[PDB]
Design an enzyme around this catalytic site. Structure first.
Site, PDB file in Angstrom:
ATOM      1  N   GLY A  56     -45.229 -28.799  13.209  1.00  0.00           N
ATOM      2  CA  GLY A  56     -46.458 -29.580  13.059  1.00  0.00           C
ATOM      3  C   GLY A  56     -46.780 -30.073  11.651  1.00  0.00           C
ATOM      4  O   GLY A  56     -47.932 -30.413  11.366  1.00  0.00           O
ATOM      5  N   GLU A  74     -36.330 -31.195  15.388  1.00  0.00           N
ATOM      6  CA  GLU A  74     -37.078 -30.948  16.602  1.00  0.00           C
ATOM      7  C   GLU A  74     -38.564 -30.981  16.265  1.00  0.00           C
ATOM      8  O   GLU A  74     -38.961 -30.519  15.190  1.00  0.00           O
ATOM      9  CB  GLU A  74     -36.643 -29.618  17.231  1.00  0.00           C
ATOM     10  CG  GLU A  74     -37.272 -29.287  18.590  1.00  0.00           C
ATOM     11  CD  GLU A  74     -38.597 -28.553  18.464  1.00  0.00           C
ATOM     12  OE1 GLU A  74     -38.934 -28.120  17.341  1.00  0.00           O
ATOM     13  OE2 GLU A  74     -39.312 -28.433  19.485  1.00  0.00           O
ATOM     14  N   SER A  75     -39.371 -31.554  17.169  1.00  0.00           N
ATOM     15  CA  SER A  75     -40.815 -31.714  16.965  1.00  0.00           C
ATOM     16  C   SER A  75     -41.133 -32.477  15.661  1.00  0.00           C
ATOM     17  O   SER A  75     -40.627 -33.582  15.459  1.00  0.00           O
ATOM     18  CB  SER A  75     -41.497 -30.355  16.990  1.00  0.00           C
ATOM     19  OG  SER A  75     -42.836 -30.472  17.439  1.00  0.00           O
ATOM     20  N   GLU A 124     -42.850 -29.896  28.194  1.00  0.00           N
ATOM     21  CA  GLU A 124     -43.295 -30.097  26.830  1.00  0.00           C
ATOM     22  C   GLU A 124     -44.710 -29.588  26.566  1.00  0.00           C
ATOM     23  O   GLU A 124     -45.000 -29.076  25.468  1.00  0.00           O
ATOM     24  CB  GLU A 124     -43.207 -31.588  26.461  1.00  0.00           C
ATOM     25  CG  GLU A 124     -41.796 -32.126  26.350  1.00  0.00           C
ATOM     26  CD  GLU A 124     -41.082 -31.629  25.075  1.00  0.00           C
ATOM     27  OE1 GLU A 124     -41.735 -30.959  24.244  1.00  0.00           O
ATOM     28  OE2 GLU A 124     -39.876 -31.917  24.898  1.00  0.00           O
ATOM     29  N   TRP A 138     -42.047 -15.993  27.061  1.00  0.00           N
ATOM     30  CA  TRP A 138     -43.239 -16.667  27.587  1.00  0.00           C
ATOM     31  C   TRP A 138     -43.267 -16.537  29.108  1.00  0.00           C
ATOM     32  O   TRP A 138     -42.221 -16.383  29.738  1.00  0.00           O
ATOM     33  CB  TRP A 138     -43.277 -18.139  27.173  1.00  0.00           C
ATOM     34  CG  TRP A 138     -43.399 -18.312  25.704  1.00  0.00           C
ATOM     35  CD1 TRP A 138     -42.374 -18.507  24.819  1.00  0.00           C
ATOM     36  CD2 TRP A 138     -44.603 -18.290  24.930  1.00  0.00           C
ATOM     37  NE1 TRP A 138     -42.866 -18.607  23.537  1.00  0.00           N
ATOM     38  CE2 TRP A 138     -44.230 -18.472  23.569  1.00  0.00           C
ATOM     39  CE3 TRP A 138     -45.955 -18.115  25.243  1.00  0.00           C
ATOM     40  CZ2 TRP A 138     -45.160 -18.509  22.532  1.00  0.00           C
ATOM     41  CZ3 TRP A 138     -46.886 -18.141  24.209  1.00  0.00           C
ATOM     42  CH2 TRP A 138     -46.480 -18.338  22.861  1.00  0.00           C
ATOM     43  N   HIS A 168     -41.740 -26.244  25.056  1.00  0.00           N
ATOM     44  CA  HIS A 168     -41.438 -26.887  23.801  1.00  0.00           C
ATOM     45  C   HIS A 168     -40.690 -25.910  22.890  1.00  0.00           C
ATOM     46  O   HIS A 168     -41.111 -24.765  22.735  1.00  0.00           O
ATOM     47  CB  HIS A 168     -42.746 -27.360  23.152  1.00  0.00           C
ATOM     48  CG  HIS A 168     -42.558 -28.130  21.883  1.00  0.00           C
ATOM     49  ND1 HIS A 168     -42.215 -29.466  21.864  1.00  0.00           N
ATOM     50  CD2 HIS A 168     -42.703 -27.759  20.587  1.00  0.00           C
ATOM     51  CE1 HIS A 168     -42.142 -29.884  20.612  1.00  0.00           C
ATOM     52  NE2 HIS A 168     -42.426 -28.864  19.820  1.00  0.00           N
TER      53      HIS A 168
HETATM   54  C1  LIG Z   1     -44.146 -22.733  16.773  1.00  0.00           C
HETATM   55  N1  LIG Z   1     -42.987 -23.678  16.729  1.00  0.00           N
HETATM   56  C2  LIG Z   1     -42.556 -24.179  15.517  1.00  0.00           C
HETATM   57  C3  LIG Z   1     -41.529 -25.034  15.411  1.00  0.00           C
HETATM   58  C4  LIG Z   1     -40.847 -25.465  16.595  1.00  0.00           C
HETATM   59  C5  LIG Z   1     -41.242 -24.994  17.788  1.00  0.00           C
HETATM   60  C6  LIG Z   1     -42.371 -24.050  17.924  1.00  0.00           C
HETATM   61  C7  LIG Z   1     -42.709 -23.621  19.165  1.00  0.00           C
HETATM   62  N2  LIG Z   1     -42.024 -23.854  20.418  1.00  0.00           N
HETATM   63  O1  LIG Z   1     -42.598 -23.116  21.437  1.00  0.00           O
END
Ligand SMILES: CN1C=CC=C/C1=C\NO
Ligand SMILES: *[C@@H]1O[C@H](CO[C@@H]2O[C@@H](C)[C@@H](O)[C@@H](O)[C@@H]2O)[C@@H](O[C@@H]2O[C@H](CO)[C@@H](O)[C@H](O)[C@H]2NC(C)=O)[C@H](O)[C@H]1NC(C)=O
Ligand SMILES: *[C@@H]1O[C@H](CO[C@@H]2O[C@@H](C)[C@@H](O)[C@@H](O)[C@@H]2O)[C@@H](O[C@@H]2O[C@H](CO)[C@@H](O)[C@H](O)[C@H]2NC(C)=O)[C@H](O)[C@H]1NC(C)=O
Ligand SMILES: *[C@@H]1O[C@H](CO)[C@@H](O)[C@H](O)[C@H]1NC(C)=O
Ligand SMILES: CN1C=CC=C/C1=C\NO
Ligand SMILES: CN1C=CC=C/C1=C\NO
Lengths: 538, 533
Positions: free
Chosen positions: A120, A200-201, A330, A435, A443
């Site tokens: 993020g 990623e993200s 996602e 989870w 995600h």
């Molecule tokens: C918390 N987090 C940080 C970076 C990439 C993925 C992520 C969570 N995925 O569940």
């Protein structure tokens, strides 16, 4: 005395690395190579200065510090959250990168994968176990590079126009690292003319921003965007909103003793302990929300000459190959961070009223009319109040709006304007996933397969998952080598066709062989990508 | 001399005619005058009760059709001519018809009252497809139908003026319902058991009598087929009615409301008819120039408003639609459409069609329609576009307004029965791509397939008989279900939650959920919010 394989000279001076054992053989790792001067004190919020040359040998033998960042305490001790948390001490002295190369060093120049982590833009590190480059390197004989880059206020606090906090310096960290790879990767046996960014993200959104910033674009040749896009609604901010957030952060930590001279304001921010800025970070956001992050790349004409949406539409992408995709669910991961009624520890069977409230949290900063449009599209009007369906629909809302439809839109435009694009949906739920079952494939949980983490003997993946991991590593490195994930010279294995704006073909990645399907949530994303922006202009 | 064919009503004496059906004879009294001829100074005015006469009115044949436009899209084609006037046009058209069993019932018989459709610009009670003889013989009801003024003659309005107050075509209908209250007993009919039924603008009319307190005491139950008073085409606001009335005057050479109506009254009826289509704001299918106006008198508010506020306990309603409401309308202005080919349109034609089928909404509104009705895995496939535009037109104009009426009435205390009519008539002359089009359940409700000079199948006659029974059951009891008939599958009431309706076709009743619920959520819940803000 000394092992020549673990010794390398780069433009700045000499390095000593370490020899890593992997299940399939040894790899050479140079971990914690300095690529910038420490962005300390006066250099906080400033662009990275290149690392000054050094005499003697720098030991690149373990990961360096994680850049200062918020640490998730939602589920203390829980593997599902802790695996993303810092596994080194926090420090502003964090601009180091890592190089993994085959042992012995390649004789002829070798394709380079460069990893950019997500989180993020407020968190993350290249030292996470799940980003361990040793399995890819051994299995596919590529060179892998990862870098740390500043996050949160330290990376993306922006007072646009000012020289003291210009914004986007986290992205400049990444660019400096990419420059480093061009000048130096050949010394490890890697090919500076074959570099593939993957992320990623927020790391995928970073990869996309480098696509759309010409001074980055010359530093690499292909791109992989996993579960993120630069046009994602969370991924950039306007100049004014950036200033508002910077200023409110300043205010909340006593600077100045609001607004005024930018030089005076930043100087007062620079006297605050790092941890103090981190502790106030989440309090600057305009509305309470899952999925929105205080300090993110700023659209200011410099790094990004226009919004990524505009830049994507106007771009010529001939000569470019791109690989993009999403996981199956996602949205589910994000709902436990604020959507009313959600928890990892129960079924999260929410009420209609909770769903309506969740839409506002999951789609922040849109008009009431816009929220109504979302409720309309996502309600099953033959079952308007079924909790299980509502849970699934909210997951869909959050995932579609923030990941799937930004990726689909990027994919379709890149394809239409000259790029060869490949698309996937990752549909395997890891046997080790901690989870709850209702989150499906969340995600982030394709990453461990891409990096070959199941080959780690200390972990308890199934044999089939190890085979699966090897398949994925092969696709990614095939793509890095040739721009095409398909097996060069394998016929009887099913083919991954390109993604195009018309046919919109993608493959499913799971334990079964490739299945080709059409449409990255095409009906849903038509709402997010084609209609909703017309509504926001009215 | 046959005494059965002689009846005295309040205004005087009538002579009817005995008709034949395959099941036996029926008494018919056709062309009964219920109003003074609305001619000359009486054009645009409310109907006056027919003054009493001496001697015997000849009631053995249909009377004149109210002045209206005649459809010339496909000259001689069965599919269009069956709706065209089949008696000469006249402003002297305010007559009604009564069919009764033969010999006339000697105990109070339940009454069905038929109100025809035709967009409020056309229609006649004399059309073959509205022939009361088969229902009356088979189900032993009294059946009544009236002519009411259409077009400018019935719905031209200069609001506030007493020279053209508007809605007088609706008042024609009310006056006929008042006539039924005062006179139907003389035919064996029961004035305490009157069921209104109507199709399209006739269904909209029924709904409007539901929502207007002076009409509400004139009947007891209601059937709305393929229409609803909250249809976007069924009403017009005062401001827009005045504009349309004013533009008609100008188009026919007329120049103060009193002066304006006076000039309009000097014009031959046919002249008003010739210009009526050209007063509409934009090119459109499915919009009609002169329709009921909301002015606080007949309708004290919009039918939407009135529907939401109403207490409907004590009301039973039968409502429904055909399988393909939109298809017939597309050949009257949608680019690319014809009954004489497959109408496989292009996406450009589709988008153009959307602005025609959903007229007078913002670009944003249209965009939203295009979003919800495009299959984005197949955005340009001709067959799917043809189907989708049929859905747009049918959902917007008929299905969702009927769904909204049904839902609101049920939730506010009415007992509602809903159907979808899914049988394509073996005799249908419109092309196969049109499916089951608007209007083509009516012939089955009136038992026209029992007419041996027509070419329906044996199974189609049995289906007609089923439908006549449902409709008559509903008229007798407020419930279409075969009163005590165990093993026959039951027709459940429609409710806001379960949204159950049945399919009507050659197969036994099948219960389903939702009158295009996903689509109608768009028209009924989202789209109004959009236009408002
Ligand atoms: C918390 N987090 C940080 C970076 C990439 C993925 C992520 C969570 N995925 O569940
Ligand atoms: C499902 O869980 C959420 C989250 O609450 C926490 O997790 C649960 C597993 C349980 O251990 C609770 O004690 C925890 O508080 C529940 O939502 C919360 O409900 C409480 C009380 O009703 C309320 O005070 C909180 O504000 C709620 N939190 C949110 C984010 O809405 C939810 O009710 C649980 N559903 C069940 C148990 O059916
Ligand atoms: C299907 O027919 C429509 C309607 O056109 C009329 O009817 C046809 C059966 C034929 O006799 C035509 O010549 C008639 O004009 C066609 O749409 C028309 O296309 C022409 C140009 O080719 C255009 O000038 C008209 O305006 C169109 N009419 C409408 C109502 O839009 C349509 O092309 C036919 N579909 C085919 C051929 O696939
Ligand atoms: C802010 O203060 C500095 C330090 O005195 C000085 O350059 C000037 O007053 C201000 N700078 C700018 C760029 O306005
Ligand atoms: C035939 N028709 C259809 C829609 C509107 C008006 C009309 C006729 N009047 O001329
Ligand atoms: C043209 N018309 C008039 C009244 C009722 C139905 C109708 C047509 N349906 O095809």
């Amino acid at each position: 005395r000394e092992d020549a394989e673990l010794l390398v000279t780069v433009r700045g001076g000499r390095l000593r690395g370490i020899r890593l054992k992997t299940p399939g053989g040894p790899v050479s790792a140079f971990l914690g190579i300095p690529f910038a001067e420490p962005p300390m004190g006066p250099r906080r919020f400033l662009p990275p200065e290149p690392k000054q040359p050094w005499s003697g040998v720098v030991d690149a033998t373990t990961f360096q510090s994680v850049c200062y960042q918020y640490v998730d305490t939602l589920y203390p001790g829980f593997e599902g959250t802790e695996m993303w948390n810092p596994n080194r001490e926090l420090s502003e002295d964090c601009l180091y990168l890592n190089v993994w190369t085959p042992y012995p060093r390649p004789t002829s120049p070798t394709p380079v994968l460069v990893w950019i982590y997500g989180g993020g833009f407020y968190s993350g590190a290249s030292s996470l176990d799940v980003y361990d480059g040793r399995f890819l390197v051994q299995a596919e004989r590529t060179v892998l590079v990862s870098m740390n880059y500043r996050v949160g206020a330290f990376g993306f606090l922006a007072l646009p126009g000012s020289r003291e906090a210009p914004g986007n310096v986290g992205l400049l960290d990444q660019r400096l690292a990419l420059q480093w790879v061009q000048e130096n990767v050949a010394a490890f046996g890697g090919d500076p003319t074959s570099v593939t960014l993957f992320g990623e993200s927020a790391g995928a959104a970073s990869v996309g921003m480098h696509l759309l910033s010409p001074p980055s674009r010359g530093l690499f040749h292909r791109a992989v965007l996993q579960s993120g896009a630069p046009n994602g609604p969370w991924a950039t901010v306007g100049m004014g909103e950036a200033r508002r957030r910077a200023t409110q952060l300043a205010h909340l930590v006593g600077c100045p003793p609001t607004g005024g001279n930018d030089t005076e304001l930043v100087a007062c921010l620079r006297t605050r302990p790092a941890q103090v800025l981190v502790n106030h970070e989440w309090h600057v956001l305009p509305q309470e929300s899952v999925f929105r992050f205080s300090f993110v790349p700023v659209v200011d004409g410099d790094f990004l000459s226009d919004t990524p949406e505009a830049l994507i539409n106007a771009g010529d992408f001939h000569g470019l190959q791109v690989l993009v995709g999403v996981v199956k669910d996602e949205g589910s991961y994000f709902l436990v961070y604020g959507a009313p009624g959600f928890s990892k520890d129960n079924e999260s069977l929410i009420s209609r009223a909770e769903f309506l409230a969740g839409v506002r949290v999951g789609v922040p900063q849109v008009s009431d009319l816009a929220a109504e449009a979302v409720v309309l599209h996502y309600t099953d009007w033959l079952h308007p109040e079924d909790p299980a369906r509502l849970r699934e629909a909210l997951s869909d809302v959050v995932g579609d709006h923030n990941v799937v439809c930004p990726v689909a839109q990027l994919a379709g435009r890149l394809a239409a304007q000259g790029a060869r694009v490949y698309a996937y949906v990752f549909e395997h739920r890891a046997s080790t996933l901690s989870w709850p079952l209702w989150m499906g494939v969340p995600h982030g949980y394709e990453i461990e397969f891409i990096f070959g983490i199941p080959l780690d003997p200390s972990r308890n993946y199934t044999a089939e998952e190890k085979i699966f991991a090897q398949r994925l590593m092969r696709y990614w490195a095939n793509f890095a080598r040739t721009g095409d994930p398909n097996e060069p010279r394998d016929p009887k294995a099913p083919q991954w066709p390109p993604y195009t704006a018309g046919a919109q073909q993608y493959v499913s990645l799971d334990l079964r062989p490739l299945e080709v399907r059409r449409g990255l949530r095409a009906q849903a994303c038509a709402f997010w990508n084609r209609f909703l922006p017309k509504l926001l202009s009215a």
